[PDB]
């Protein structure tokens, strides 16, 4: 015998970068939602896991191409939504401005062209201090990003509900889900399993604490490219995650003001009631117990005293716990009783004093910025803290600081890998065609 | 007993939804609809008999007409974006009158080749486009305060070339041939074709134009005849001719708006101006409404009456159609319906007036400037269907409530079906 | 016979107009795409296609039309994210560069906010600013025509070789008759999956960086007996040309309007030194001598060359691109102006820079090229002449359009479809 034969079915794969496409759980279908809009491939009978028994397989998360495609999307997906909307260019005029109290929530006024290009009409609009900037000190303020970027405003039509999104691979590929309940970011997965589409990740753009993330299975996990490196980022997961909520008691309502012909933009009308600073409440015992448990986990990879020291500062994008809520973003100090002390080895709650920002520069790309219209009615939300972007800095000092926001996406696509199936097995055998 | 066999080429089908594509006779030059894109040829003698198979379809829940409006609306978007926008023209615009009631010899300040020098200019506008800012000396373009407005390039033209839709290779398009079709339900005579043989994208809101005359018999269509909000569609047999004309000799003039951007405007009235005529053969029209009424009596057993349109705005109340490179808006009620019957060579006329600025699709944030065509233009055409809304006796008012309903008058008789030629049956054979 | 038989894999080919796509090998961005494309596609994959004849012509070709409607799209697709430079179009008041071809203008401009404006000064070349009518007040040349778009400061627009490759299921029949003029039976034909590679350099009177001719001077034209059709000469022993802008120039970031700036010329360091391009006259003179004999036998009468002047300075001058900067040279100061009966040195050409251009012979699309800081010494090969057939025959350099440049390189290719189905009788029948 000893002749070659072919098999048109065989388990074989290779690591291959490939384009992916969307799938969604069909949560409602109004088609102005930034992420879905007209929406993607409709749903599926999602449970599809496969045993894939005792296949020894290894991979590293920090090099996977799937996360990169999820930064090819979003940033390109936002552009597909911001393009039709208005430009705030005509609003970059010297602002006469003052205060509104009977906190830095100012009241500004300016020239503004009416329905005709010729006539002008004074209009008053409020602004938080993080939008205006001093001209060099009183009065004559100006919009922050107008000196480098073409400011545009998100249309009120669209919303930012972080709807779940499922990633599928084109037929002929597969995703090798890893189930080992202490997968330490990189290395062997002794209990791999396949699945045609991934879990329903939520596009939550956190920067210091990962909101609404998936909970780790029955053990605290710590991932990093190189724990021994002094500068590289580190990601921590949690079990029995902790609560965090935020509200703005100010019952604002939006006014619409003219800017030239056709174009209009929306701004704060009046402060119903009185200015009460935005709040966020966190259970003190839960945070202390939670961080205490992580303290032991962080200790057992350095074997020395670990010290929490608050963020570095210098701006508000990096040194603050920025997150989206409803459509009016927050940028929050996250340090008062949240850090600045460590452990030796009441039923109240912690408080975070923090503020609002209209013009947000996002993705750290110079030349583009977006304006979020104010959201009427008092706004409230609740979320789960499910990950910390701690950065390492005798002892060891850990500074809570987030690098590029791709870290968030690597915080839930950790247990996935893309494979290309080529079922064309070759083998010897006894036979020959007769 | 017996075993399974799979027969390829089984004719089973099921309803489906599909992204259809275009085809046409061939025509060059920047025609808006066909463009230099649509597939040519398809001379189609392939009307397969499909002998006596029962099938049912309804034009109302049909998901092909809505696909026709999912584009065309997008088709113009492809052609508006490159062209010059007309926002800078929104300036305090001072008018007195035009003579050598509805045309203004109006003047305004616009910037010359460079943005440092103004230049006094005069440009005509029909009364509809402007709105008095106020007893009146200042004016402005109507849609300035609600929407930005762009200008159609004269290079493109709206002359409707017919377009053929084609099922993707693998589907099939059915067709009903019972000429007395109900409008919904089973059809006793069915056929199939890859591509339909004719549709025209002409836009109309009160009366159809250039449409396919009914198949030898008058037809009546509706979602629900016994209802007061759903639009009735009448499809005429022995169509009645119409002709509208602009007898003026207007001359085009190009004026500038800042650097680069420029547009065309009506320069001067040449000759004696007359109101744009619209003539219809009244001798045919009289008994024409008599015949459709008799069909209406066939469903309601009583006399009927016709009134003017529902009034209000100039979008629901008026015959609106393209003569090509120009938009018409006619009263079409004052001297034209008014009444009914019991049980002389002349032609009836209509008051009509032109509008440069239009609000097509009647949606916020969209508008366009129609570049006037120089000289006289005439367009004889056939009326083939009235659109009637329902208000002892029965009352009707012409004028459809939505322009999408127009397409139902030509794409009613098609339904997309996914031919899936895989079937299972028993047999006596087994693999041996 | 008595029975047909299907023979799969049959060689049969027919003409077909169909799309073509990427090729590249070996950063921020480049105007000719190339930032992400198919790699390498090595060269030696040809089939010599022994001794089968094929007759074709280069003029009714598909690749050139397939291409000119692509490059015109590649550039247009690149300039969308960057500033439309209209706000600069204001009344200029200009003095001379006190360091006649350069002027030093002043204008008001909108600063980082609406109402506060400042006086700014920037340098310009007289070739593209027109007095507004001594006057001494000017404006940008292209303001009454159309918008002008700044070339993005970060991108680069020097040529990169791109191979055209036909989709799978087709072939490209490369002609190998080295003495072929582009019309007739190519008795030595070959087929290639992906073309050899062509360079996107634009020109109007010289074919720069182009593929060299082999053992011949070949003259190509659809009609040598026509006074408006272009003549293309393909050159034996390509000559070398050097071009330079020896001014040590610096760029200044003038701010106009909100958002982004546009880079402009600052101080002319040192003293003005006009640009020049150098040619070895003996090389050129006897290079012209070679072509003087080739076209003579196609007309049987004596010939002359002439200036080709009398135009809008786009086609009449030797317009080309190099080193991120544009050039427009007289190229007939004494360069051609000669007729033929039958020393180590050089001849030099005076040239003009232009800051804004209108390329692809169209209107509605003009662009601004920011200056290149420092000196440049553009050097290139020369391989062809876009001569024009104007007792004796008169010749004048200059093409009729810009597709002629591409038509010089893609003549030895024709896209073709392969039909692997062929029926033929055979003695057998199914068992």
């Amino acid at each position: 015998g000893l002749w070659v034969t072919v098999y048109y079915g065989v388990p074989v794969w290779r690591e291959a970068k490939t384009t992916l496409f969307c799938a969604s759980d069909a949560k409602s279908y109004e088609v102005h939602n930034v992420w879905a809009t007209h929406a993607c491939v409709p749903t599926d009978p999602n449970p599809q896991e496969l045993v894939l028994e005792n296949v020894t397989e290894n991979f590293n998360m920090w090099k996977n191409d799937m996360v990169d495609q999820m930064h090819e999307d979003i940033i390109s997906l936002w552009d597909q939504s911001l393009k039709p909307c208005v430009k705030l260019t005509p609003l970059c005029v010297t602002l006469n401005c003052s205060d509104a109290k009977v906190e830095e929530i100012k009241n500004c006024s300016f020239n503004a062209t009416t329905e005709l290009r010729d006539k002008k009409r004074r209009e008053y609009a409020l602004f938080y201090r993080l939008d205006i900037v001093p001209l060099s000190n009183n009065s004559e303020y100006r919009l922050i990003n107008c000196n480098t970027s073409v400011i545009t405003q998100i249309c009120p039509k669209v919303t930012f509900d972080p709807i779940p999104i499922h990633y599928c691979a084109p037929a002929g590929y597969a995703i090798l889900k890893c189930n080992n309940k202490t997968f330490n970011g990189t290395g062997p997965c002794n209990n791999v399993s396949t699945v045609q589409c991934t879990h329903g990740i939520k596009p939550v753009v956190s920067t210091q604490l990962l909101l609404n993330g998936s909970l780790a299975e029955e053990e605290i996990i710590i991932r990093s490219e190189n724990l021994t490196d002094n500068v590289k980022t580190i990601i921590v997961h949690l079990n029995e995650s902790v609560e965090i909520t935020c509200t703005r008691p100010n019952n604002m309502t939006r006014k619409s003001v003219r800017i030239g012909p056709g174009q209009t933009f929306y701004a704060l009308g009046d402060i119903i009631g009185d200015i009460r600073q935005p709040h966020c409440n966190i259970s003190e015992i839960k945070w202390e117990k939670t961080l205490q448990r992580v303290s032991e986990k962080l200790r057992e990879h350095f074997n020395k005293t670990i010290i929490f020291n608050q963020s570095s500062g210098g701006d508000l994008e990096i040194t603050t716990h920025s997150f989206n809520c409803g459509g009016e973003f927050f940028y929050c100090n996250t340090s008062d009783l949240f850090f600045n002390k460590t452990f030796n080895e009441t039923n109240s709650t912690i408080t975070l004093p923090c503020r609002i920002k209209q013009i947000i520069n996002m993705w750290q790309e110079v030349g583009r910025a977006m304006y979020a219209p104010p959201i009427a009615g008092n706004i409230t939300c609740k979320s789960n803290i499910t990950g910390l972007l701690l950065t390492r800095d005798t002892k060891e000092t850990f500074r809570p600081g987030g690098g590029n926001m791709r870290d968030n996406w690597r915080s839930e696509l950790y247990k996935y890998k893309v494979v290309e199936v080529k079922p064309l097995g070759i083998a010897p055998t006894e036979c020959n065609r007769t | 007993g017996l075993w399974v066999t799979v027969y390829y080429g089984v004719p089973v089908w099921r309803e489906a939804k599909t992204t259809l594509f275009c085809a046409s006779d061939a025509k060059e030059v920047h025609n808006v609809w066909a463009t230099h894109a649509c597939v040519p040829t398809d001379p189609n003698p392939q009307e397969l008999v499909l002998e006596n198979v029962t099938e049912n379809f309804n034009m109302w829940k049909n998901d092909m007409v809505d696909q026709m409006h999912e584009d065309i609306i997008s088709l113009w978007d492809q052609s508006l974006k490159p062209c010059v926008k007309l926002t800078p023209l929104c300036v305090t615009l001072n008018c007195s009158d035009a003579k050598v009631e509805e045309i203004k010899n109006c003047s305004f300040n616009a910037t010359t080749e460079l943005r440092d020098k103004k230049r006094r200019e005069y440009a005509l506008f029909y009364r509809l486009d402007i709105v008095p800012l106020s007893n009146n000396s200042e004016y402005r373009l109507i849609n300035c305060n609600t929407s930005v407005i762009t200008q159609i390039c004269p290079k493109v033209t709206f002359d409707p070339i017919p377009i053929h839709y084609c099922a993707p290779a693998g589907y099939a398009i059915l067709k009903c041939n019972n000429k007395t079709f109900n409008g919904t339900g089973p059809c006793n005579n069915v056929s199939t074709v890859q591509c339909t043989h004719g549709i025209k994208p002409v836009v109309s809101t009160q009366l159809l134009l250039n449409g396919s005359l009914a198949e030898e018999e008058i037809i009546i269509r509706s979602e629900n005849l016994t209802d007061n909000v759903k639009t009735i569609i009448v499809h005429l047999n022995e169509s009645v001719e119409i002709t509208c004309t602009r007898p003026n000799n207007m001359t085009r003039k190009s004026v500038r708006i800042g650097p680069g951007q420029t547009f065309y405007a009506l320069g001067d009235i040449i000759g004696d101006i007359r109101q744009p005529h619209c003539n219809i053969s009244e001798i045919k029209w009289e008994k024409t409404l008599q015949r459709v009424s008799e069909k209406l009596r066939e469903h309601f057993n009583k006399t009927i009456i016709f009134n003017q349109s529902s009034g209000g705005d100039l979008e629901i109340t008026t015959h609106s159609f393209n003569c090509g490179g120009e938009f018409f808006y006619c009263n079409t009620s004052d001297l034209f319906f008014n009444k009914t019957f019991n049980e002389t060579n002349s032609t009836i006329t209509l008051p009509c007036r032109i509008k440069q600025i239009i609000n097509m699709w009647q949606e916020v944030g969209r508008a366009m400037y129609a570049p006037p065509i120089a000289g006289n233009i005439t367009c004889k055409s056939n009326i083939t269907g009235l659109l009637l809304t329902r208000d002892t006796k029965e009352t009707f008012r012409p004028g459809g409530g939505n322009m999408r309903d127009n397409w139902r008058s030509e794409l009613y008789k098609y339904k997309v079906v996914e031919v899936k030629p895989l079937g299972i049956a028993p047999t006596e054979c087994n693999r041996t | 016979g008595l029975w047909v038989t299907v023979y799969y894999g049959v060689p049969v080919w027919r003409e077909a107009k169909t799309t073509l796509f990427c090729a590249s090998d070996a950063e921020v961005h480049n105007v000719w795409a190339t930032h992400a494309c198919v790699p390498t596609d090595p060269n030696p994959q040809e089939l010599v296609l022994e001794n089968v004849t094929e007759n074709f012509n280069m003029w009714k070709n598909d690749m050139v039309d397939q291409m000119h409607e692509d490059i015109i799209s590649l550039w247009d697709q690149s300039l969308k994210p960057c500033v439309k430079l209209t706000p600069l179009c204001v009344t200029l008041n200009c003095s001379d560069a006190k360091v006649e071809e350069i002027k030093n203008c002043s204008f008001n401009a909108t600063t980082e906010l609406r109402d506060k404006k400042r006086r700014e000064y920037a340098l310009f070349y007289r070739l593209d600013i027109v007095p507004l009518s001594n006057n001494s007040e000017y404006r940008l040349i292209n303001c009454n025509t159309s918008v002008i778009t700044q070339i993005c400061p970060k991108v680069t627009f020097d040529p990169i070789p791109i191979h055209y490759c036909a989709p799978a299921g087709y072939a490209i029949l490369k002609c190998n008759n080295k003495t072929f003029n582009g019309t007739g039976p190519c008795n030595n034909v070959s087929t290639v999956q992906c073309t050899h590679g062509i360079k996107p350099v634009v020109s109007t009177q010289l074919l720069l960086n182009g593929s060299l001719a082999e053992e011949e001077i070949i003259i190509r034209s659809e009609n040598l007996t026509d006074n408006v059709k272009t003549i293309i000469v393909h050159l034996n022993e390509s000559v070398e040309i050097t071009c330079t802008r020896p001014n040590n120039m610096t760029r200044k970031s003038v701010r106009i309007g909100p958002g982004q700036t546009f880079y402009a010329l600052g101080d002319i360091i040192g003293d003005i030194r006009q640009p020049h391009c150098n040619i070895s006259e003996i090389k050129w003179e006897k290079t012209l001598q070679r072509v003087s004999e080739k076209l003579r036998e196609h007309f049987n009468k004596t010939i002359i060359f002439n200036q080709s002047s009398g135009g809008d300075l786009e086609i009449t001058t030797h317009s080309f691109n190099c080193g991120g900067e544009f050039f427009y040279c007289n190229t007939s100061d004494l360069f051609f102006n000669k007729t033929f009966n039958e020393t180590n040195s050089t001849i030099t050409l005076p040239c003009r820079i232009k800051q804004i251009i209108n390329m692809w012979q169209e209107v509605g699309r003009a662009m601004y090229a920011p200056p290149i800081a420092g000196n440049i010494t553009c050097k290139s090969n020369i391989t062809g002449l876009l001569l024009t057939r104007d007792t004796k025959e008169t010749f004048r350099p200059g093409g009729g359009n810009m597709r002629d440049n591409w038509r010089s390189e893609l003549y030895k290719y024709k896209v073709v479809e392969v039909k692997p189905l062929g029926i033929a009788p055979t003695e057998c029948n199914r068992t």
Partner: antibody, heavy 132, light 111 residues
Framework: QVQLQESGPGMVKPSETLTLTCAVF??????????WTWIRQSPTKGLEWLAG????????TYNPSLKSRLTISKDPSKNQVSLKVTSVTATDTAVYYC???????????????????????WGQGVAVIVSS | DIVMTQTPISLPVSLGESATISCRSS????????????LEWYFQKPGQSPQLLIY???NRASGVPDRFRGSGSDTDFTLKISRVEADDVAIYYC?????????FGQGTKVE
């Protein structure tokens, strides 16, 4: 800015018609941003405004008190503006000026501001005496 | 036609002092017109032609110093010199520029 200069006879006979000229340096007479005008400095009454014309080609307007006897025009061919005084009286003896009332018009897409800066630049002034 | 009154007609002063000049309108002035208060001031040394000082009530001419400043109500208009000096000796003219013909006042002679 515009350097400017008046020129014309300074000695005039009574009751005759006088023509005065002013040549523009560094600009155009017809450009719309300017509004040329002439002013006289009398000894008793002082300064007074006579006429001005620019922009809309034929756009003259004269003081009602002296509306009867004035005429003014311009030509880019020589780039000057000339004023004609018909039937001069002895009281008209005074220094006459030519002045450029400056306008402007900037269109930055969104807003089209427009106005004037008064009479920016004045000529040297030409003295005319009515005597014989 | 519309006449401007002026006070003072003359004012002697030494170096370092501040001076105030006023002129009043007759026909309303700043009558809307979608414009603004079109009032202007001019000064003239002996022998030389008049030159611009202020326009639109409170805007200084090209490159002139802060030695002076103007203000005015709907119909009342005033001019003040912050600190007089030697070269300030001249005749100051109140000029309105609302409607044609423009009308000056009969000077304000300050020494």
């Amino acid at each position: 800015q515009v350097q400017l200069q008046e020129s014309g006879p300074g000695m005039v006979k009574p009751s005759e018609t006088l023509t005065l000229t002013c040549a523009v340096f560094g600009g155009r007479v017809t450009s719309g941003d300017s509004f040329w005008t002439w002013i006289r400095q009398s000894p008793t009454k002082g300064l007074e405004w006579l006429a001005g014309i620019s922009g809309d080609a034929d756009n003259p307007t004269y003081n009602p008190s002296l509306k009867s006897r004035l005429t003014i025009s311009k030509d880019p061919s020589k780039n000057q503006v000339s004023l004609k005084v018909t039937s001069v009286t002895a009281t008209d003896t005074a220094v006459y000026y030519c002045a450029r009332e400056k306008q402007y018009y900037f269109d930055d897409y969104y807003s089209v501001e427009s106005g004037r800066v008064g009479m920016d630049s004045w000529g040297q002034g030409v003295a005319v005496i009515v005597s014989s | 036609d519309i006449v401007m009154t002026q006070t003072p007609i003359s004012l002697p002063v030494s170096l370092g002092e501040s001076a105030t000049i006023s002129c009043r309108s007759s026909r309303s002035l700043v009558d809307r017109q979608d414009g603004k208060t079109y009032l202007e001031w001019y000064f003239q040394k002996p022998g030389q032609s008049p030159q611009l000082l202020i326009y639109e009530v409170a805007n200084r001419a090209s490159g002139v110093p802060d030695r002076f400043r103007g203000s005015g109500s709907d119909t009342d208009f005033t001019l003040k010199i912050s600190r007089v000096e030697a070269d300030d000796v001249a005749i100051y003219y109140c000029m309105q520029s609302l409607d044609p013909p423009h009308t000056f006042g009969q000077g304000t002679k300050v020494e």
